[PDB]
């Protein structure tokens, strides 16, 4: 009842709809990003959500223990864990920035209002060049002007290192909801009501709701939309399976999938609406076009929202409340992502059941030491590289392998009966077709297009060198290469001839009685042709 609805709210809003979605909408065409996003959502965001929810609820294992249905494909369980670790590495930095801004908001005069300060260049325009908020961010919080690229980083900054330490301590002691869940909705509604009334908001709304029919012919908005759907829904991170492994057996995993995706899409739409409504007003007030008012990067919202707060009556209170909300949202997301990895590695190995605090300490210390790279002078370059290369092709490859392993090796007709065991009904033809044919081919197309059509990352005008791209590709392939290695190890470890090795490697562990009598279900084509 109310506990069910309060659980949907927690999954409906996260840091991926407030921080990344508007920045990806602005980077691509305004309104040309909403067509691939909605198409990919409808096609392969509900089937995958349903699949992971049901798999976790039925097999009662975190991330790699659910692969008793196909022992040879356990490498995706480690791939998703590596992806989660990589994501958390740069996920901590956003919380550090939010803490910095929250501490800086306790003033009678906000520091990002005018440019008379010591961190301002002559190229600053006051309501007329660079805006005071972007200059304040870059040259007072990041100190980006002292870095000459990714090959020249410098020592870490002592102001942001303290925030990172505080975030790490809080996360560890939280890992070892009535107020925390309904605060972002109130804040976003208030911001939307404010931004609707601003003089130049209609132009931004029109640019947001207009679809450009020439930006859809480029193979970048599709990849961005697919990766953003994966980021927002949590598919491909190992989080949904781990969360659902604790749910009741006779739980309706279909209604949850139907409702959570709808509410998530509505929240994403509202966030983009607010951001573009403020962008239009800024562009009108600065006498510049909408596309030439900011840079495409993870500095949006951090540049926009302070300027929106500055126009409210008592701006200090609004700023404090907004940054507290952002801090809580980021903490929740990071703690969930880290708990996924911790529980997966605890379930996998047996010695660690006597190493709980001494394992969480190791994980958080490694995360802190790896996040220390992004608090240097040139940390935004490392942030951009990580954001481009940690997920994307690797996460889509992992999702494709998971879908293939569940729908072709185990069997969609057996998955349906497993669902019908816990819930009184079984999936219809639409769900089975989407699981078996529609989703895998689209995922394969997106993966192939992403690999063949490579676009180097950039931050405004800086173009990354060759070795940066090589290191990024190594980082991306490190998690992807976990499937063939485990497959080869599993094949070589099992005893018997080739046929017996294959039979024990592809058949489920609950079918050993049938396999021992020469009754392998995967040695006939009726099993592979059945939808
Ligand atoms: F095991 C679980 C325990 C708790 C939760 C809570 O949700 C967290 C919301 N997720 C949204 C999806 N994000 C995508 C990954 C990004 C990321 C970031 C850093 C490192 C790695 C990955 C992860 C976070 C929750 C909240 C209300 C509730 F009622 C129940 C659970 C989930 C699973
Ligand atoms: C900046 O400060 C100087 C000295 O305090 C002052 O003369 C100048 O007018 C200020 N700039 C603006 C735009 O007011
Ligand atoms: C700032 O403006 C001056 C002109 O007054 C210009 O010469 C300089 O290049 C500008 N700085 C930039 C664009 O970084």
Three-state secondary structure readout of 115-144: CCCCCCCCCCCCCCCCCHHHHHHHHHHHCH
**Structure-token match 């306790």, residue found:** 106
Ligand 2 pocket check: which of 114, 116, 127 to mutate, most ligand atoms within 8 Å of Cβ?
116
> Which resolution in angstroms does this entry have?
3.0
* Integer Cα distance of 169 and 183 in angstroms: 24
The β-bridge partners of 462 are 459
* Integer Cα distance of 248 and 411 in angstroms: 24
Q: 332 is written with which tokens? A: 């929740």
Instruction: Please give the domain boundaries of the chain with CATH numbers for all domains.
Output: 2-493 (1.20.1740), 494-531 (no CATH)
Q: How far is the CA of 392 from the centre of ligand 1 (A)?
A: 19
Q: What DSSP string runs through 45-90?
A: THHHHHHHHHHHHHH--SSSGGGGGSGGGTHHHHHHHHHHHHHHHH
Q: Judge whether 332 is annotated as a binding position.
A: yes
Q: Judge whether 277 is annotated as a binding position.
A: no
Q: How far is the CA of 123 from the centre of ligand 3 (A)?
A: 6
Instruction: Find all residues with CB under 8 Å of 48, minimum gap 6, and list them.
Output: 233, 235, 399, 403, 439
Burial class (CB in 10 A: 0-12, 13-18, 19+), 47: buried
Q: 502 is written with which tokens? A: 């294959």
Instruction: Find all residues with CB under 8 Å of 348, minimum gap 6, and list them.
Output: 63, 64, 65, 77
Experiment used for this model: cryo-EM
Q: How far is the CA of 106 from the centre of ligand 2 (A)?
A: 24
**Structure-token match 């599993």, residue found:** 490
* Integer Cα distance of 80 and 77 in angstroms: 6
Q: Judge whether 220 is annotated as a binding position.
A: no
Ligand 3 pocket check: which of 115, 122, 129, 138 to mutate, most ligand atoms within 8 Å of Cβ?
122
| b/e code 119-152 from CB counts within 10 Å (16+ = b) | ebeeebeeeeebbbbbbbbbbbbbbbeebeebee
Q: How far is the CA of 288 from the centre of ligand 3 (A)?
A: 17
Nearest Cα residue to atom 14 of ligand 3? 123
* Integer Cα distance of 14 and 268 in angstroms: 10
Q: 388 is written with which tokens? A: 């481009």
Cβ atoms of 409 and 487 closer than 8 Å: no
Question: Quick one: which of 72, 77, 75 has its CA closest to 506?
Answer: 72
Cα angle 423, 63, 447 (rounded to 5 degrees) comes to 100
Q: Judge whether 88 is annotated as a binding position.
A: yes
| b/e code 363-379 from CB counts within 10 Å (16+ = b) | bbeebbebbbbbbbbbb
Q: In ligand 2, which atom is closest to the CA atom of 116?
A: 1
Q: How far is the CA of 103 from the centre of ligand 2 (A)?
A: 26
Nearest Cα residue to atom 1 of ligand 3? 123
Nearest Cα residue to atom 4 of ligand 3? 123
- Ligand sitting nearest the alpha carbon of 395: 1
Q: In ligand 3, which atom is closest to the CA atom of 122?
A: 1
Q: 512 is written with which tokens? A: 């050993």
Q: How far is the CA of 122 from the centre of ligand 3 (A)?
A: 7
User: What are the percentages of helix, strand and coil residues in the chain, rounded to 5?
Assistant: 70, 0, 25
84 lines ligand 1 (CB under 6 A): yes
495 lines ligand 3 (CB under 6 A): no
Q: How far is the CA of 11 from the centre of ligand 1 (A)?
A: 7
Instruction: Find all residues with CB under 8 Å of 417, minimum gap 6, and list them.
Output: 426
* Integer Cα distance of 167 and 161 in angstroms: 10
Instruction: Find all residues with CB under 8 Å of 24, minimum gap 6, and list them.
Output: 33, 224, 228
Q: Is the dihedral of CA 76, 80, 85, 90 positive or negative?
A: positive
Q: How far is the CA of 128 from the centre of ligand 2 (A)?
A: 16
Q: Judge whether 414 is annotated as a binding position.
A: no
Nearest Cα residue to atom 13 of ligand 3? 123
Q: Judge whether 98 is annotated as a binding position.
A: no
Q: Judge whether 59 is annotated as a binding position.
A: no
Question: Quick one: which of 152, 193, 183 has its CA closest to 10?
Answer: 183
Q: How far is the CA of 131 from the centre of ligand 3 (A)?
A: 14
332 lines ligand 1 (CB under 6 A): yes
Q: Judge whether 203 is annotated as a binding position.
A: no
């Amino acid at each position: 009842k109310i506990d069910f609805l309060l659980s949907v709210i927690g999954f409906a809003v996260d840091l991926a709809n407030v921080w990344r979605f508007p920045y990806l909408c602005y980077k691509n065409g305004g309104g040309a990003f909403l067509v691939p996003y909605l198409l990919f959502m409808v096609i392969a965001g509900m089937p995958l959500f349903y699949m992971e929810l049901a798999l976790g609820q039925f097999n009662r294992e975190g991330a790699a223990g659910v692969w008793k249905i196909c022992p040879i494909l356990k490498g995706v369980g480690f791939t998703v864990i590596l992806i989660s670790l990589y994501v958390g590495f740069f996920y901590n930095v956003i919380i550090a920035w939010a803490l910095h801004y929250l501490f800086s908001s306790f003033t009678t005069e906000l520091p990002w209002i005018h440019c008379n300060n010591s961190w301002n260049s002559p190229n600053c325009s006051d309501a007329h060049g660079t805006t005071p908020a972007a200059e304040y961010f870059e040259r007072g919080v990041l100190h980006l002007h002292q870095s000459h690229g990714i090959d020249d980083l410098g020592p870490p900054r002592w102001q942001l290192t303290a925030c990172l330490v505080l975030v790490i301590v809080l996360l560890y002691f939280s890992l070892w909801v009535w107020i925390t869940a309904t605060m972002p909705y109130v804040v976003l509604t208030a911001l939307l009501l404010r931004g609707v009334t601003l003089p130049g908001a209609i132009d931004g709304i029109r640019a947001y709701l207009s679809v450009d029919f020439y930006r859809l012919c480029e193979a970048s908005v599709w990849i961005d939309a697919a990766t953003q759907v994966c980021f927002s829904l949590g598919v491909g991170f190992g989080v949904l399976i781990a969360f659902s492994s604790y749910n009741k057996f006779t739980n309706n995993c279909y209604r949850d999938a139907i409702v959570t995706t709808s509410i998530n899409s509505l929240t994403s739409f509202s966030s983009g609406f607010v951001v573009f409504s403020f962008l239009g007003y800024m562009a009108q007030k600065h006498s510049v076009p909408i596309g030439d008012v900011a840079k495409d990067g993870p500095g949006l919202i951090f540049i926009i929202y302070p300027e929106a707060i500055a126009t409210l009556p008592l701006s200090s209170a609004w700023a404090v409340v907004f940054f507290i909300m952002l801090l809580t949202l980021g903490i929740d997301s990071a703690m969930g992502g880290m708990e996924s990895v911790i529980t997966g590695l605890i379930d996998e190995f047996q010695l660690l059941h006597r190493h709980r605090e001494l394992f969480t300490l190791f994980i958080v210390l490694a995360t802190f030491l790896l996040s220390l790279f992004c608090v240097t002078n040139g940390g935004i370059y490392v942030f951009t590289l990580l954001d481009h290369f940690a997920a994307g092709t690797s996460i889509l490859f992992g999702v494709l392998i998971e879908a293939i392993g569940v729908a072709w090796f185990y069997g969609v007709g057996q998955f349906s009966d497993d669902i019908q065991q816990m819930t009184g009904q079984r999936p219809s033809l639409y769900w089975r077709l989407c699981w078996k044919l529609v989703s895998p081919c689209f995922l394969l197309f997106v993966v192939v297009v992403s690999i063949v059509t490579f676009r180097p990352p950039h931050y405004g005008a800086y173009i990354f060198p060759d070795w940066a791209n090589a290191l990024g590709w190594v980082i991306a392939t490190s998690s992807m290469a976990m499937v063939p290695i485990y497959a080869a190890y599993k094949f070589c470890s099992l005893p018997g001839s080739f046929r017996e090795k294959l039979a024990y490697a592809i058949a489920p562990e609950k079918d050993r009685e049938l396999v021992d009598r020469g009754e392998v279900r995967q040695f006939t084509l009726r099993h592979w042709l059945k939808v």
